[PDB]
RNA sequence: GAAACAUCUCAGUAUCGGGAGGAACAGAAAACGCAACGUGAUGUCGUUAGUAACCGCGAGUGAACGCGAUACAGCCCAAAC
RNA sequence: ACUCGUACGGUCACUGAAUCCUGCCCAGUGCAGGUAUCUGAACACCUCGUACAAGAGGACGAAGGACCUGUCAACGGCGGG
RNA sequence: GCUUUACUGCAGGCUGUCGCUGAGGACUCUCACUCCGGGAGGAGGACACCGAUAGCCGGGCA
């Protein structure tokens, strides 16, 4: 049969529609007033969480991060530059807003590692992701056999460096064929085309 | 007044002193922050790879 | 070229600034909850720096000791009163609701309780006109008639050092000495004087400006310079 | 100059003569949908466009003639060399 | 550089911000598509090839599949119950 | 920033104490207001096209422009016969 | 370096459109949102701000 979990999953397939719609309406006037970065107890999406790898366990962290939606906050430029480079407005990051979120959650927390995120809506302003965070020094993470891998030395910083999911898709390596040239084994290798 | 050698007779002020952290006469004592190190500015020593030849 | 003089304005250095460490009081509306009971006796008549006209100090029941922006005629022991249920004698504040029409008025509030925005300078005054449930209109001292919520508090009286302007500043340093007290740079070098470099209307062989004077409103910083927006120049016509 | 509606002449098609009728080429509407369209959309971003940022040249003084000499028997068209013409009138 | 120059080129180079390791990154197919009765995680080396592709179709730019090698290693969740 | 500021303010410009004065021109350019009608992009909408899409056309029409008015202590002009 | 009705572009301003954004070719409301108020509460309000796009102006700048 139907596991509870599906139907959070089914709920967030259209967060505009049904009694999401009511609940995002309110939640967001709370959001709005609170911080960058906000530790939470419980996930608002238990199965995307679940999914991702959350256990209810000691080691274990959630955070939700506001990050403003839209392009670039470019400065102009100073100097000469030729008219290809004279761009302000149209000039877009090459990370999407989900991974500078993740940056900001693991900044908070020096000690975690980020094990993986998703996004939890937005407004006309803001987008919203909420965090997942593991203690790599906590024993009750350094016994689990399905998180203790994040405890290894190379796994250290892992989102500045793109180690993290949504870190993977952005460096465009989710194909493995037609596409990736460019993109596999790193993009710096690749001379950054990708 | 000329810029030259009548100009240089006001020079009595002390900005550039031995610093703290690196030793070299790089620390301003009016900005708190060594030319040199970068001690006062950053925990990070100044370093920049323009200090030597780019393929070196 | 260069930035213009208006742009570095805007970084909000030193030469621009006004000198905010050498000012007094920030001349608002005292702060009552309902019932009127707050009346204050005045102590002394001080001069102001930030507005060239004076301010008078004055002591309240509770034992606030705040200086306040006086209208003409108040003096040394004089009693003013603050609220609802207050006198409507010179140098009272009460919301516009409860003060009669033709009645001239000053420190007039935008928006009911910001302290007062309105009829601030020397000599000048507001005149509060109609009245009704919703709207009180005042006629500000550019002529303008203002719609305004009757709940605004206001002064009653004109802003005290009236004829200020009467008389001129004769002498250059006169002129110094009151601007070393504002936010503003002086003295004022004529575009129509300047390099190319550093004006719209700097270069040439002779001194005039390099194109007409009326600039739009679309115009960027920079460029915003002269008769901005202009709906007509000149004298006659 | 002034030219005839309908003349005789050969046709490649026919492998005859045949009594052909002169039309003026009319310009066939843009689809948009060829590869320099594409290009256009694609090469077009930030600054100059390089060859899509160029606005089209003049006009010769003359323009040569373009016509389509249409057979009377088999129906089909064929283009020939055109010449320098101020104006091109037809008669009847 | 294009014998000017704007796209293009120099070049994702110089330089800047952040971060790991002794190596990093990648990695067990929603792959390939010598179309097959075929291959079988990933790097890398040789080649494929200055080929396909791009480009004021100018100057220039420029892969991949495959193949020969090196080394080889495959697994754990979420959910169902 | 201006601003512990509020039109007797302060911003942006021109001229340059006082005294006597400061003529005529709004066609061009600038600014500003208006505007029946004309022109005026994209989204949505309608027609055609495509089992879809590209695309073609239409309807509506903002600011702006056309047009009209105001303005020279606004740029300036004040001749030939 | 500087100028402009040189070429090409880039900021910026104005304006339409989409999102935020809700209830009953002009209108009412309040619940998001904004501002004022110490607070109670008041003003405004699906506009404005902001994100995106489109047209116009655009030697301010390259
Ligand atoms: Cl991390
Ligand atoms: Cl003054
Ligand atoms: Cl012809
Ligand atoms: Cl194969
Ligand atoms: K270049
Ligand atoms: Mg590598
Ligand atoms: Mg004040
Ligand atoms: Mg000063
Ligand atoms: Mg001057
Ligand atoms: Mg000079
Ligand atoms: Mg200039
Ligand atoms: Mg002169
Ligand atoms: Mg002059
Ligand atoms: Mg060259
Ligand atoms: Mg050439
Ligand atoms: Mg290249
Ligand atoms: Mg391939
Ligand atoms: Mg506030
Ligand atoms: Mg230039
Ligand atoms: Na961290
Ligand atoms: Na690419
Ligand atoms: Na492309
Ligand atoms: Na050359
Ligand atoms: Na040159
Ligand atoms: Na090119
Ligand atoms: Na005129
Ligand atoms: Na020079
Ligand atoms: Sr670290
Ligand atoms: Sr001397
Ligand atoms: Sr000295
Ligand atoms: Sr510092
Ligand atoms: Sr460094
Ligand atoms: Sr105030
Ligand atoms: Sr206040
Ligand atoms: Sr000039
Ligand atoms: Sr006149
Ligand atoms: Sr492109
Ligand atoms: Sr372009
Ligand atoms: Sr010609
Ligand atoms: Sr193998
Ligand atoms: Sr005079
Ligand atoms: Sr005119």
Redesign the interface.
Known sequence: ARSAYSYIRDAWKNPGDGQLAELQWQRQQEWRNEGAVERIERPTRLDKARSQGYKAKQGVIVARVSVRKGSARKRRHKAGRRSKRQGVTRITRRKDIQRVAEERASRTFPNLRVLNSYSVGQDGRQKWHEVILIDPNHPAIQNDDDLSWICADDQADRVFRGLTGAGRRNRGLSGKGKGSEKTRPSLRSNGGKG | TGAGTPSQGKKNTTTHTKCRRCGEKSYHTKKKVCSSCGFGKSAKRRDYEWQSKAGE | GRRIQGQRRGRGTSTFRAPSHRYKADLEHRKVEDGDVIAGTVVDIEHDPARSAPVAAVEFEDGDRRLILAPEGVGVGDELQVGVSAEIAPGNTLPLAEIPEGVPVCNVESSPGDGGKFARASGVNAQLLTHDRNVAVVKLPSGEMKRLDPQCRATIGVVAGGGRTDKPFVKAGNKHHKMKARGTKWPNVRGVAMNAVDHPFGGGGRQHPGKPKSISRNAPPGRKVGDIASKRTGRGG | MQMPRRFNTYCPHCNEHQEHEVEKVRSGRQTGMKWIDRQRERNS????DGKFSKVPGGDKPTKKTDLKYRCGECGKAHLREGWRAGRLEFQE
């Open positions: 971003g930030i600054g100059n």
